[PDB]
Design a protein around this ligand. Structure first.
Ligand code: SLB
Length: 308
């Protein structure tokens, strides 16, 4: 078969838009390399979660993974800006904030230099909404709600600041937790709610619109070093096409999925978001205290972009 047998790990499962785009990536790479590269895919946290996988890219033990810009906060806390709730208004602002600002370029350089990882392309992974086993009519209904979050500082802070009881748990554990009422809710973009069938086990959806997720196609520098230049170019080009498809999948899913969910019996609320935004405002201050002048710059540059 192939000269290069590469591995691509992800948290998302095999019915997800992420998996659809990663399968497209693997196909494009096999075709354009003339069969010289073959890509195996390990979804559903088969290799661990995304923190483990990012570490495996760093260590040269895994070739590819997906990760949010914001996830880099586990190494470079200033990256948290990408996840601060209600701070980034759309994908265009997120992508330009990473690629076209001095802050973002500085962060990409650190990732390459210190973590041994290159960003191949940037995709949209949806805006997070809140499912539950009780109606969320306003921020008041968050109070004491047992809200699963991923194992991520910003989602923990979101739950805390709205009044909820944050319960961190790996993605792979969520469906059972919802089904059994071990937690009262969780929070994820619409397409994820569909792919994991969380709508099967949650009677309610609230459009809290709280955190916008991007999605980085990541490659280990050890992988790039293992590939000849012309196959490096194949990989880079394929990642560019896959990200565009990935983003389209999420945009078209978001535009359609509330109606789908209603048709499956889900009750869909639209709480006033003004008090959600006000509740999180002070967490921006925590960010600024933790990250100093780099943090300040990040927020100014995003503000300027959002203004366009
Ligand atoms: C690239 C990646 O693995 N994204 C995953 C994210 C991030 O881990 C989290 O947003 C913190 O960055 O968590 C999920 O939304 C979740 O567990 O609910 C699953 C999703 O597949």
């Amino acid at each position: 078969g192939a000269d290069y047998d590469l591995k691509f790990g992800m948290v998302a499962g095999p019915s997800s838009n992420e998996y659809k785009a990663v399968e497209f990536f693997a196909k494009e790479v096999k075709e354009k390399s003339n069969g010289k590269i073959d890509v195996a895919i390990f979804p559903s946290s088969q290799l661990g979660d995304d923190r483990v996988m990012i570490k495996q890219l760093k260590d040269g033990a895994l070739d590819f993974t997906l990760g949010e810009s914001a996830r880099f906060q586990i190494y470079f806390p200033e990256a948290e800006v990408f996840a601060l709730p209600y701070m980034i208004p759309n994908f265009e602002t997120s992508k330009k904030a990473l690629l076209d600002t001095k802050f973002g370029q500085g962060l990409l350089k650190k990732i390459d230099k210190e973590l041994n990882v290159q960003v191949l392309s940037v995709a949209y992974n949806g805006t997070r909404q809140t499912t539950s086993n009780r109606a969320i009519n306003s921020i008041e209904d968050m109070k004491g709600l047992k809200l699963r979050v991923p194992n991520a500082a910003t989602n923990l802070a979101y739950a805390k600041y709205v009044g909820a009881a944050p319960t961190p748990m790996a993605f792979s554990e969520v469906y059972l937790a919802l089904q059994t009422n071990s937690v009262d809710g969780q929070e994820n973009p619409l397409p994820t709610i569909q792919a994991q069938k969380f709508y099967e086990v949650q009677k309610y959806l609230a459009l809290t619109n709280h955190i916008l997720n991007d999605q980085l196609y990541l490659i280990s520098n050890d992988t790039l070093a293992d590939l000849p230049e012309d196959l490096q170019k194949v990989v880079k080009d394929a990642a560019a096409k896959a990200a565009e498809y990935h983003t389209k999948l999420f945009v078209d899913g978001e535009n359609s999925l509330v109606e789908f969910f209603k048709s499956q019996g889900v009750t869909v609320t639209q709480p006033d978001l003004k008090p959600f935004k006000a509740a999180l405002t002070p967490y921006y201050d925590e960010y600024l205290k933790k990250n100093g002048e780099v943090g300040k710059m990040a927020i100014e540059e995003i503000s300027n972009l959002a203004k366009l």
